[PDB]
Amino acid sequence: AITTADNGNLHTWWHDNAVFNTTGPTGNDEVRRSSFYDLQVAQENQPDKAYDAFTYMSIPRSGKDKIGYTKEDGAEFSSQAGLTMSWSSFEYAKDVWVDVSLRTGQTITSADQVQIRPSSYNFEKQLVDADTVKIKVPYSDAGYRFSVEFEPQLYTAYNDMSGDSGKLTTEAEGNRAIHTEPRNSMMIFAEPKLRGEQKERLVPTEESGSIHYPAEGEVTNLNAVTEEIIYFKPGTYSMGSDYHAVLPPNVKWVYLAPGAYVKGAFRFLHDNQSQYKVTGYGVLSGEQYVYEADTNNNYNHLSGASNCHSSCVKMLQFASADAEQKLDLQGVTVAEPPYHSFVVYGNEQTFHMNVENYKQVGSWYWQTDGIELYKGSTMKNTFFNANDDVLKMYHSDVTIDNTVIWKNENGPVIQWGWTPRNIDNVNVTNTTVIHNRMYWKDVKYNTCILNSSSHWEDMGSTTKADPNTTVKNMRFENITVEGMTNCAIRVYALSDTENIHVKNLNIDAWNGLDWTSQVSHLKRYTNPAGEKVTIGNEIPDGNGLALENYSVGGEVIEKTADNWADHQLGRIGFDGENWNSWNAWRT
């Protein structure tokens, strides 16, 4: 018998319309339940009172065939290898014991056969029996988002080395290891219970404004709501494959309660509010939308153009007026996006975001970009699964802390390239890339942990830079990369570039590709007239690219230690002309 919690210290929930389905799209009124894991939670001093918490599951393309296209969409390997991503959310206010049970019939011999990533979370684990581990999750006001990895679920992705770039395969023989991870992943989002002033800010009441409460089922009428707040109670809601909510000017807040599951997407078309909010510990899933679902094409797949950068369905979209505005984006899990997760158009300097306890899961397709934080924004305590640029660092005065990342195949983790940019004062701390499948045999411009990709208009051109733009004063401190990866950093500088600091980029291992495919780059591009951008002087001015405590396999890479070059452990193949614009040293 399912028993959920709803007390002051613990909140869990269920979906009575849950279904097991590993093969195809669920019904409009159904929620996909994990076939592979069951989870229960108890307050640590009440270990006998364990409550069920639902475990959701996303599968590549929702198991759909490609409708309206045959080209690659980026979900080929994940679909063919049978990858899935399960996740369970709950609210807690006090240390808990979480029981995680594997449903497959596979067994484990010890709690050591269940690994937690981030590995820095040295949670106490106890083996209850041969399919169940108990994990002690301490309370933090940030909560914890982490992966639970049963050894029998691990597989290794290999690059078959075919053609120019290779292709991923689960076949080992004669191929190159790329990364080892659970085939059926299991994320736990242990989120802080909201009280006091935080609850008042993040959970609407009837005192917050007029509220529209959608009924469970089809929700295709949201464009004409007249209330200020749309509040989704626990339950399941469906926008369909051919509609997303384009919200009227009165709506300032969308709230997804814990236990709400909304299939759909939201666009705040109007720019008239001083404060926008999208909050709550519910789920917003794009599972019903086709890859590159184009609003110019009746929501069918993109037809008759090069891109749909501004017309394909986004999970969340806002408009920024010249006036100063704020958005609180909190709590929600964005699942199975058909395109980019998040965008703001308008005045990109006057839309200040406060993002926290936000998650993106099931990012199987290419172009499932993570978040772009606009000028003067902060983000903390998040989880991103993405199959494109994960952290789009395109704006000044941006601060990020405590990001757990499950990277897929395509794009880098951190991106600041693609166009010349003017950026100052960026700080990104405590990033853990727990997995990645970055695999390319050829030396691509848009990959590695950190990246300034070449220009989107022509990635092979070296004349697309602008020396009259400057990217400067960006600090990345603590980037923990677990398992194998492909490369550390590739900067194709499209702007003058100054005082970039990467501290404690710690990589467990390189993958099985040739070392030439693992190279890190630092190159100065020109404008069409031939004027080169400049990289600041690092030796001795400290105004170039600083790699402080960059390590591989625990060994710090040092310019003075003979372990830095392209054929050495550090894999650094920076242009010789830029020698005095970088340093690698041990503190």
Defining traits:
587 residues, mainly beta, Dex49a from penicillium minioluteum complex, domain 1, 2 domains, 21-stranded mixed sheet, six-stranded mixed sheet, 42% strand, globular
Question: Can you characterise this structure?
Answer:
This protein has 587 residues and is an all-beta fold. It has 2 domains: 203 residues, Sandwich (Dex49a from penicillium minioluteum complex, domain 1); 384 residues, no CATH class. Helix content is 2%, strand content 42%. The strands form 7 sheets. It has a 21-stranded mixed β-sheet that branches. Strand 10 and strand 11 form a beta hairpin. The chain is globular.
Secondary structure elements and pairings:
Blueprint: E1 10-11, E2 18-20, E3 31-33, E4 37-43, E5 51-53, E6 56-58, H1 76-81, E7 84-92, E8 96-102, E9 114-117, E10 125-129, E11 132-137, E12 144-150, E13 154-159, E14 168-169, E15 176-182, E16 184-192, H2 196-202, E17 211-212, E18 217-218, E19 229-232, E20 235-238, E21 245-247, E22 253-256, E23 260-263, E24 266-268, E25 275-279, E26 283-285, E27 316-320, E28 325-330, E29 333-335, E30 342-346, E31 351-356, E32 359-361, E33 371-372, E34 377-386, E35 391-392, E36 398-407, E37 414-415, E38 423-435, E39 450-452, E40 466-485, E41 489-493, E42 495-510, E43 521-524, E44 545-548, E45 551-552, E46 555-556, E47 582-585
